[PDB]
């Protein structure tokens, strides 16, 4: 039934590995992490009462003129991608909600979903985004929550239809999400009006970011110039925006460059908070950054310690210590951090067997070159270790550039770096030259992401593509231009509703229809697994990973009511076609269940 | 320092091939290492004070009889132990 369910995936887990590859032989270790305590009572004021009391430009207004300085925590979302695979279970974050609303009460608001939340979440991870944002709310009626958001494709790497986004957008504000990061890889305008225009529609806060590359500071970059920075945010403030942001996945803010642009932004806009969002890849974070506090900036976005340095945000504790002697009067209690900190860092040591310190055991310099996405750069290194890529892994990385190049510099986040990516992949395993790939392409092959991006579908760059490529590959396929969204035919949900209904539902909600319309086939994937094994998120880090050692027991909460003491006792050998006998003891009743080998 | 004066003026690029080339030579003491143990660079060396080449061996030790819980209470009295020696300037 239930119980027995569980126990069946225990007992597959055993005789097996985990479904997920584990790239390196090591195990977690036997260190669980501390939890500090906190008193019971309704915890200190943020900013959400003003959400839910005044207007949003009213609370905008409150913010900007507010004395002093504010952070956004991101502890859910961009250090997953930036250090391991983005695989830290809601079971682990389930503890610390009550901890930090009752402690810390001057942060702007939360960030939870992002790029790896669903993907991730969908296929190495059995869990549910959706599930795991409902809960969220009912413990901290504290401080807001953001995501971050993709323009043109509403969730995926192509676009979709515009009314798909309406529903995301609309059932985001519905169960509990707050403000919305209105961002797309490229400089494609009508992504960025689509997606703060949908943010609007819905009714909610429109907070909008710009990516940034390259050296501002100097004038020989000309691609991206000085004017065409303002000259986006002055429109996109023409179309109504309430938060303007400078997007940086790369990290390669400079404080000569950060002064600056924080300075031109302040002069035409004394009015409207500035916000901004990097990665402290290089290790030159936290320079830049209280440059950029010091100049001008009003919303900060940071992550713990424990998740500090390496490649992702930079720490709390050390601006707090920097940051407090100050005018911008950071003025948290700070040793509260220290505990937050070391049980994060106790907590870390379980997820051992993946990490960017895998093997590149510093942090990640050579972006300021490299430009790859932090997040994208720890996930290559990851799957290229599992699969043996040592020092051959650095021409991987090689062909990287030439391939951005020939497809002309880009700017690139969530789309557009993936196609990058497997573009060179493919270019660097047939083993090919620059000189003959402009040549001779329309024989060459190339993988479909390379079509797809060629026919038009992400939209045009700042600086266009080549034609002779297109031309050469392409052939006489049809070509998408202006808007895709416009140009592909609105379809009705409502049918995939009705399909998915006779599928394997009679209850479901539309949330899952949504989910589905990410991609249909790991959707049915999932529904089976949990169909198949149990329900999930009752299981611990190492008992998912690792698995139970014999003879230890352990308790596991799923209901209310329903409470359960296991402990493994042994398990039988290969009989004669690879099934074995496995015995587990429940509280006051003992049973065994067969469970069949693969390996044979 | 590229847009200061404080000119710098190092060549860049093979700086790089230097870090890449001690990060293949540094796996070669895999054994032990500090990255190893502790994960990442942490707050909370103000009110501990500890000098730079003993913090390495202290967590060893700490982490490797398993006093990652008790770990907080040797840095709890070291400012007082400290203090009983007098406020000092320690290397």
């Known amino acids: 039934n239930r119980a027995q369910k569980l126990l069946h995936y225990l007992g597959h887990v055993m005789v097996?590995?985990?479904?997920?590859?584990?790239?390196?032989?090591?195990?977690?270790?036997?260190?669980?992490?501390?939890?500090?305590?906190?008193?019971?009572?309704?915890?200190?004021?943020?900013?959400?009462?003003?959400?839910?009391?005044?207007?949003?430009?009213?609370?905008?207004?409150?913010?900007?003129?507010?004395?002093?300085?504010?952070?956004?925590?991101?502890?859910f979302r961009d250090a997953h991608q930036s250090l391991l695979a983005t695989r830290v279970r809601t079971h682990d974050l389930k503890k610390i909600a009550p901890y930090v609303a009752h402690n810390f009460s001057k942060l702007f608001s939360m960030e939870n979903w992002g790029g790896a939340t669903f993907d991730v979440a969908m296929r190495f991870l059995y869990e549910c985004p959706w599930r795991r944002l409902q809960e969220l709310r009912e413990l901290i009626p504290n401080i807001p929550f953001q995501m971050l958001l993709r323009g043109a494709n509403a969730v995926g790497y192509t676009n979709y239809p515009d009314n798909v986004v309406f529903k995301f957008c609309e059932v985001a504000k519905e169960n509990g999400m707050d403000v919305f990061r209105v961002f797309d890889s490229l400089n494609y305008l009508p992504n960025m009006l689509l997606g703060m225009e949908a943010a609007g529609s819905a009714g909610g806060v429109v907070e909008a970011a710009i990516s940034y590359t390259g050296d501002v500071a100097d004038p020989s970059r000309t691609k991206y110039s000085l004017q065409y920075y303002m000259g986006l945010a002055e429109e996109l403030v023409r179309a109504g925006t309430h938060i303007l942001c400078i997007k940086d996945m790369a990290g390669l803010l400079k404080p000569t460059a950060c002064t600056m642009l924080v300075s031109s932004l302040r002069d035409r806009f004394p009015d409207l908070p500035l916000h901004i969002h990097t990665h402290d890849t290089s290790g030159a974070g936290v320079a830049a950054m209280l440059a950029c506090?010091?100049?001008?900036?009003?919303?900060?976005?940071?992550?713990?310690?424990?998740?500090?340095?390496?490649?992702?945000?930079?720490?709390?504790?050390?601006?707090?210590?920097?940051?407090?002697?100050?005018?911008l009067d950071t003025e948290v209690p700070m040793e509260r951090v220290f505990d937050y900190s070391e049980y994060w860092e106790g907590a870390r040591g379980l997820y051992a067997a993946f990490d960017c310190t895998a093997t590149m055991k510093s942090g990640n310099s050579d972006v300021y070159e490299n430009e790859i996405p932090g997040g994208q750069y720890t996930n290559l290194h990851f799957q290229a270790h599992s699969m043996g890529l040592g020092s051959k892994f650095k021409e991987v990385k090689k062909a990287y550039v030439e391939a951005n190049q020939m497809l002309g510099d880009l700017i690139k986040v969530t789309p557009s770096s993936k196609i990058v990516g497997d573009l060179a992949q493919?270019?660097?395993?047939?083993?090919?030259?620059?000189?003959?790939?402009?040549?001779?392409?329309?024989?060459?092959?190339?993988?479909?992401?390379?079509?797809?991006?060629?026919?038009?579908?992400?939209?045009?760059?700042?600086?266009?593509?080549?034609?002779?490529?297109?031309?050469?590959?392409?052939?006489?396929?049809?070509?998408?231009?202006?808007?895709?969204?416009?140009?592909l035919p609105p379809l009705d949900l409502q049918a995939l509703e009705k399909e998915?209904?006779?599928?394997?539902?009679?209850?479901?909600?539309?949330?899952?229809?949504?989910?589905?319309?990410?991609?249909?086939?790991?959707?049915?994937?999932?529904?089976?697994?949990?169909?198949?094994?149990?329900?999930?998120?009752?299981?611990?880090?190492?008992?998912?990973?690792?698995?139970?050692?014999?003879?230890?027991?352990?308790?596991?909460?799923?209901?209310?009511?329903?409470?359960?003491?296991?402990?493994?006792?042994?398990?039988?050998?290969?009989?004669?076609?690879?099934?074995?006998?496995?015995?587990?003891?429940?509280?006051?009743?003992?049973?065994?269940?067969?469970?069949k080998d693969t390996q044979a």
């Open 500 to 595: 998915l209904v006779d599928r394997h539902g009679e209850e479901v909600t539309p949330e899952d229809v949504l989910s589905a319309a990410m991609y249909p086939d790991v959707f049915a994937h999932f529904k089976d697994f949990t169909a198949t094994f149990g329900p999930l998120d009752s299981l611990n880090t190492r008992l998912f990973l690792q698995g139970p050692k014999i003879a230890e027991e352990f308790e596991v909460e799923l209901e209310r009511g329903k409470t359960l003491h296991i402990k493994a006792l042994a398990v039988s050998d290969l009989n004669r076609a690879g099934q074995r006998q496995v015995f587990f003891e429940l509280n006051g009743q003992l049973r065994s269940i067969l469970v």
């Open 16 to 75: 097996n590995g985990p479904t997920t590859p584990i790239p390196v032989k090591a195990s977690p270790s036997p260190t669980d992490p501390v939890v500090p305590a906190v008193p019971i009572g309704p915890p200190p004021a943020g900013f959400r009462d003003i959400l839910l009391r005044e207007g949003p430009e009213g609370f905008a207004r409150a913010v900007r003129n507010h004395p002093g300085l504010l952070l956004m925590d991101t502890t």
């Open 426 to 487: 493919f270019m660097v395993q047939n083993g090919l030259s620059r000189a003959e790939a402009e040549a001779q392409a329309e024989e060459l092959s190339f993988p479909r992401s390379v079509v797809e991006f060629l026919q038009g579908y992400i939209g045009v760059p700042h600086g266009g593509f080549p034609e002779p490529f297109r031309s050469k590959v392409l052939k006489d396929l049809p070509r998408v231009e202006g808007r895709p969204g416009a140009s």
């Open 293 to 327: 506090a010091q100049a001008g900036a009003d919303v900060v976005d940071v992550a713990a310690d424990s998740m500090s340095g390496m490649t992702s945000q930079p720490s709390m504790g050390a601006l707090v210590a920097c940051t407090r002697g100050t005018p």
